[PDB]
């Protein structure tokens, strides 16, 4: 008599980059062995957007990073049920 139910759902965001500490943070995210996160666009350079498919669980803790960072993104796709 027990049972539990779960999900995901994934989401992209647009960032643009310009400065070195911004692009040290994303690696710096990336970089933390749990999310792995994937770049479309190598934002190892400013002036490339990027634009990874961030876990909605982890969309916040990222768009905190983000404004942490004073770094400037966007949300290209959501997910809706």
């Known amino acids: 008599?027990?049972?539990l139910e779960?999900?995901?759902g994934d989401q992209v965001l647009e960032i643009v980059p310009?400065?070195?500490e911004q692009i040290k943070n994303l690696?710096?995210?990336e970089a933390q062995e749990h999310l792995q996160l994937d770049?479309?666009?190598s934002p190892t350079t400013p002036g490339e957007t990027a634009h990874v498919r961030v876990?909605?669980?982890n969309v916040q803790a990222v768009?905190?990073?983000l404004e942490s960072q004073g770094i400037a993104y966007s949300?290209?796709?959501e997910d809706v049920q």
Request: no cysteine.
């Open 55 to 57: 876990p909605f669980v």
């Open 63 to 65: 768009k905190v990073f």
């Open 6 to 8: 779960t999900f995901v």
């Open 75 to 77: 949300i290209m796709i």
């Open 39 to 41: 770049f479309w666009k």
């Open 18 to 20: 310009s400065n070195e």
């Open 1 to 3: 008599m027990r049972s």
């Open 27 to 29: 690696l710096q995210l």
